[PDB]
Design a protein around this ligand. Structure first.
Ligand SMILES: C[C@@H](O)[C@H](NC(=O)c1ccc(C#Cc2ccc(CN3CCOCC3)cc2)cc1)C(=O)NO
Ligand SMILES: [Ca+2]
Ligand SMILES: [Cl-]
Ligand SMILES: [Zn+2]
Length: 300
């Protein structure tokens, strides 16, 4: 059988708060037709504003990835999109009653569980992949983000925090999803912030919804969360989760390899824009036989 596009098999509902705005928000995920892509919808507005989750609609990348259309924004899309990418969802409507996606527990875990509880639905159209044909690299300062050709999907990231909790730890990780499960090894990795910054962030209307229930809080010499970490390398694994979500703004699953060095949402988006512009470096492919494809997906 061909690798088919996927949507949701049932409507999903969740309530939460935006990490940065602190606003209560109702999230509804709905099935969508073939070739829709992932589309965010601000249903608190009338008429609604619908914003496709595509690189061309990224309008801001400070702290989190933000989609913009007209005067309207949808903040912090990366963790939800990481779950969508991790589960291979092509088409979905994402309804929000406020401007920011709920942070949940700070990871993609709750979204992944809500989606897999609803189930996925294959659709009668070939799933389209973007295959990297040539290396594409962007840099700014000491930050770097690269796409290289690779027969599969692989993401590597390196952080370099000048901080006592990070020095001497695993600050580089590589995940090849032919041998590593997105669900078990990436999806549960939570976002993190530094205690030293919280008052300043709040003074800028940032991290207003943050709590130890949705973020790892790193103090000057210790992790504050009394219940501990989920992974010894949870920090760099969360950066990989972020990269997977930002990369899904291409609108299709990737066949290739990503390597990031201190690359945040801004440089991730610049990599996507450079790749899209360099049309010699990529192609759209489909698979008439899932058995011969370089990527495989779980049953729906
Ligand atoms: C990883 C990045 O790349 C990015 N995350 C961020 O920028 C980011 C994340 C989280 C936060 C936060 C927070 C916060 C936590 C708790 C409290 C209240 N507590 C009261 C009791 O004592 C302790 C404090 C207040 C605020 C701030 C910033 C990302 O994940 N992007 O996707
Ligand atoms: Ca921002
Ligand atoms: Cl950046
Ligand atoms: Zn994140």
């Amino acid at each position: 059988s061909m690798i088919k596009q996927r949507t949701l098999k049932n409507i999903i509902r969740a309530t939460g708060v935006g990490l940065h705005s602190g606003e209560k928000v109702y999230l509804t995920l709905k099935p969508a037709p073939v070739d829709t892509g992932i589309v965010f919808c601000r249903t608190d507005l009338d008429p609604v504003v619908e914003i496709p989750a595509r690189a061309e609609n990224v309008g801001e990348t400070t702290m989190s990835t933000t989609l913009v259309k007209g005067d309207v924004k949808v903040d912090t899309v990366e963790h939800l999109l990481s779950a969508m990418a991790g589960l291979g969802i092509d088409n979905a409507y994402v309804e929000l009653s406020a401007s920011e996606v709920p942070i949940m527990d700070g990871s993609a875990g709750p979204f992944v569980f809500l989606i897999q509880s609803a189930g996925l639905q294959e659709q009668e159209a070939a799933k389209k992949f973007i295959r990297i044909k040539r290396e594409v690299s962007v840099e700014e300062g000491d930050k770097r983000a690269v796409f290289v050709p690779f027969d599969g999907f692989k993401v590597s990231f390196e952080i370099d925090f000048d901080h006592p909790v990070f020095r001497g730890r695993t600050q580089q990780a590589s995940v090849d999803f032919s041998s590593t499960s997105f669900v078990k090894e990436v999806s549960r990795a939570r976002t993190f912030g530094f205690m030293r910054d919280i008052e300043y962030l709040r003074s800028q209307n940032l991290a207003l919804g943050g709590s130890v229930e949705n973020a790892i809080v790193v103090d000057e010499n210790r992790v504050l969360n009394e219940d501990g970490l989920r992974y010894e390398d949870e920090f760099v694994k969360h950066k990989i989760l972020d990269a997977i979500g930002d990369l899904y703004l291409l609108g299709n699953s990737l066949i290739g390899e990503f390597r990031g060095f201190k690359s945040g949402h801004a440089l991730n988006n610049q990599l996507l824009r450079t790749l899209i512009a360099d049309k010699d470096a990529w192609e759209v492919v489909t698979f008439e036989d899932a058995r011969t494809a370089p990527i495989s997906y779980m049953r729906p």
